[PDB]
Design an enzyme around this catalytic site. Structure first.
Site, PDB file in Angstrom:
ATOM      1  N   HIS A   1     -12.864 -30.881 -11.428  1.00 54.12           N
ATOM      2  CA  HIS A   1     -12.980 -29.927 -12.531  1.00 54.12           C
ATOM      3  C   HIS A   1     -14.416 -29.853 -13.038  1.00 54.12           C
ATOM      4  O   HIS A   1     -14.961 -28.762 -13.247  1.00 54.12           O
ATOM      5  CB  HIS A   1     -12.013 -30.354 -13.647  1.00 54.12           C
ATOM      6  CG  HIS A   1     -11.998 -29.471 -14.865  1.00 54.12           C
ATOM      7  ND1 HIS A   1     -10.933 -28.647 -15.165  1.00 54.12           N
ATOM      8  CD2 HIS A   1     -12.875 -29.337 -15.891  1.00 54.12           C
ATOM      9  CE1 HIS A   1     -11.166 -28.023 -16.309  1.00 54.12           C
ATOM     10  NE2 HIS A   1     -12.339 -28.419 -16.768  1.00 54.12           N
ATOM     11  N   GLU A   2     -15.046 -31.014 -13.248  1.00 51.58           N
ATOM     12  CA  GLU A   2     -16.440 -31.036 -13.691  1.00 51.58           C
ATOM     13  C   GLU A   2     -17.376 -30.472 -12.625  1.00 51.58           C
ATOM     14  O   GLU A   2     -18.345 -29.774 -12.953  1.00 51.58           O
ATOM     15  CB  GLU A   2     -16.870 -32.464 -14.059  1.00 51.58           C
ATOM     16  CG  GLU A   2     -16.128 -33.085 -15.257  1.00 51.58           C
ATOM     17  CD  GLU A   2     -15.989 -32.147 -16.456  1.00 51.58           C
ATOM     18  OE1 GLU A   2     -16.946 -31.415 -16.790  1.00 51.58           O
ATOM     19  OE2 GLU A   2     -14.923 -32.187 -17.110  1.00 51.58           O
TER      20      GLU A   2
ATOM     21  N   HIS B   1     -17.349 -26.766 -12.931  1.00 52.85           N
ATOM     22  CA  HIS B   1     -18.250 -26.258 -13.968  1.00 52.85           C
ATOM     23  C   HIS B   1     -19.707 -26.283 -13.508  1.00 52.85           C
ATOM     24  O   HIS B   1     -20.461 -25.331 -13.749  1.00 52.85           O
ATOM     25  CB  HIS B   1     -18.106 -27.081 -15.255  1.00 52.85           C
ATOM     26  CG  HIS B   1     -16.850 -26.820 -16.031  1.00 52.85           C
ATOM     27  ND1 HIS B   1     -16.385 -25.548 -16.299  1.00 52.85           N
ATOM     28  CD2 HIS B   1     -15.990 -27.669 -16.643  1.00 52.85           C
ATOM     29  CE1 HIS B   1     -15.283 -25.627 -17.024  1.00 52.85           C
ATOM     30  NE2 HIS B   1     -15.018 -26.902 -17.243  1.00 52.85           N
TER      31      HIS B   1
ATOM     32  N   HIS C   1     -13.288 -21.982 -17.453  1.00 55.19           N
ATOM     33  CA  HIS C   1     -11.858 -22.154 -17.708  1.00 55.19           C
ATOM     34  C   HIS C   1     -11.095 -20.850 -17.469  1.00 55.19           C
ATOM     35  O   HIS C   1     -11.633 -19.757 -17.639  1.00 55.19           O
ATOM     36  CB  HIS C   1     -11.615 -22.653 -19.134  1.00 55.19           C
ATOM     37  CG  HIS C   1     -12.059 -24.065 -19.351  1.00 55.19           C
ATOM     38  ND1 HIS C   1     -12.457 -24.546 -20.581  1.00 55.19           N
ATOM     39  CD2 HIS C   1     -12.148 -25.111 -18.487  1.00 55.19           C
ATOM     40  CE1 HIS C   1     -12.781 -25.826 -20.463  1.00 55.19           C
ATOM     41  NE2 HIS C   1     -12.598 -26.191 -19.204  1.00 55.19           N
TER      42      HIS C   1
HETATM   43 ZN   LIG Z   1     -13.551 -27.788 -18.358  1.00 56.70          ZN
END
Ligand SMILES: [Zn+2]
Length: 347
Positions: free
Chosen positions: A298-299, A302, A308
């Protein structure tokens, strides 16, 4: 007769001998349990390299329909697969004392819990005589039994400040936070999920191969605040003359725990592009505990520009889902663009 793994007694040497037998062309292995028989076709993962303190860790894939993967180092092995929509990890360490320490570690959250269903969430596996040879963990059933506080990602990213002949090697330098104990099965699973979430997008293995390395850093976060911790981490990378000339790689500070407000990780948003990466800008932080699979993925999303989404089955949902794949086509386009892909190249 087809090779098989007996989940009622699976040990490190069981997994090692089977996976070390996987050649270039794959190998059929049958997973067996009470009333359970699944044939999986296993292949070596040649896309990703991992060293943990110079110890080499190898990855293995099943077919998509198999919902199975593996991890193998000299010291430990992992089998993870899905049954009835729930992930189950079998975690086996080679040395008896470290296996006992790992089993006691994973038993800790259940020491006040008695459920009569506990074994469906966590179970020590014994040799076929009272020596633990692996542990079995179902984190979905563990969460239902424990009813623990649910961490999340709200506000987990800050703003900064012809196909290639060969994929570009991108190093992901993971730094164990000063004072953190990180178990190799946990960090290796996070790395595997992170790399695989990217390869699944726009055929990106043509463009990138990730190489993870893990070392310890003297840096530790000065408070419980994640944003302050990440700002300090990036500053510590620039201050360190060791890292001179690797400012164009990706960096994660890793710990077992979480940050204030149950924050699971943090990253500089949209901070890596294969053509412009510099100044340690492509950096973030991530928990590695087994109950939160995919936080590193997830990181990394980004860092590669993913936002999101409102889809609760997505890796990039704003609260923790446990899912491991990008589903937003908007996110797939910017991740692939930042890694050198163009639409004309196809998938
Ligand atoms: Zn996030």
């Amino acid at each position: 007769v087809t090779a098989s793994i007996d989940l009622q007694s699976v040990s490190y040497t069981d997994l090692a001998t089977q996976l070390n037998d996987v050649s270039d062309f794959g190998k059929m292995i049958i997973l067996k349990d009470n009333g359970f028989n699944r044939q999986v076709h296993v292949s070596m993962d040649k896309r990703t390299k991992i060293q943990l303190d110079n110890e080499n860790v190898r990855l293995f894939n099943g077919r998509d329909k198999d919902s199975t993967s593996f991890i193998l180092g000299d010291e430990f092995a992992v089998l993870r697969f899905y049954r009835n929509g729930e992930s189950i990890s079998y975690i086996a360490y080679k040395e008896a004392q470290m296996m006992n320490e790992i089993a006691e570690f994973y038993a800790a959250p259940f020491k006040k819990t008695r459920a009569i269903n506990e074994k469906e969430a966590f179970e020590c596996i014994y040799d076929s005589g009272k020596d633990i040879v692996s542990v079995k963990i179902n984190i979905d059933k563990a969460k239902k039994i424990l009813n623990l506080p649910e961490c999340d990602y709200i506000n987990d990213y800050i703003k900064t400040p012809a196909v290639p002949s060969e994929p570009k090697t991108v190093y992901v330098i993971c730094l164990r936070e000063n004072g953190s104990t990180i178990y190799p099965n946990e960090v290796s699973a996070q790395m595997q999920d992170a790399a695989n979430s990217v390869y699944a997008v726009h055929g990106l293995k043509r463009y990138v191969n990730f190489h993870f390395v893990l070392y310890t850093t003297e840096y530790s976060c000065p408070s419980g605040d994640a944003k302050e911790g990440l700002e300090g981490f990036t500053a510590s990378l620039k201050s360190n003359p060791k890292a001179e000339g690797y400012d164009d790689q990706i960096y994660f500070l890793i710990r077992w725990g979480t940050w204030d407000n149950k924050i699971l990780g943090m990253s500089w948003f949209n901070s890596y592009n294969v053509n412009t990466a510099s100044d340690f800008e492509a950096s973030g932080m991530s928990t590695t505990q087994l109950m939160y699979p995919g936080v590193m993925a997830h990181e990394l999303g980004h860092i590669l520009g993913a936002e999101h989404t409102d889809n609760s089955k997505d890796l990039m949902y704003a609260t923790f889902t446990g899912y491991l794949s990008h589903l937003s086509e908007k996110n797939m386009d910017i991740i692939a663009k930042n890694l050198g892909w163009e639409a004309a190249d196809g998938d």
